[PDB]
Amino acid sequence: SDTRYNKDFINNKLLNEHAH
Secondary structure (H helix, E strand, O other), X not given: OOOOOOHHHXXXXXXXXXXX
Protein backbone atom coordinates (compact mmCIF):
# COMPACT_ATOMS: atom_id res chain seq x y z
CA SER A 1 0.00 0.00 0.00
CA ASP A 2 2.85 2.53 0.88
CA THR A 3 4.42 1.90 -2.63
CA ARG A 4 1.90 4.01 -4.76
CA TYR A 5 -1.13 1.64 -4.09
CA ASN A 6 -3.33 3.67 -1.60
CA LYS A 7 -6.34 4.35 -4.02
CA ASP A 8 -4.34 5.86 -7.01
CA PHE A 9 -2.35 8.03 -4.42
CA ILE A 10 -5.70 9.50 -2.88
CA ASN A 11 -6.98 10.64 -6.37
CA ASN A 12 -9.25 7.49 -6.63
CA LYS A 13 -10.39 8.52 -2.86
CA LEU A 14 -13.68 7.56 -4.55
CA LEU A 15 -13.77 11.48 -5.23
CA ASN A 16 -13.97 11.12 -1.29
CA GLU A 17 -17.14 8.90 -1.03
CA HIS A 18 -18.44 10.38 -4.42
CA ALA A 19 -17.34 13.95 -3.15
CA HIS A 20 -18.73 14.78 0.39
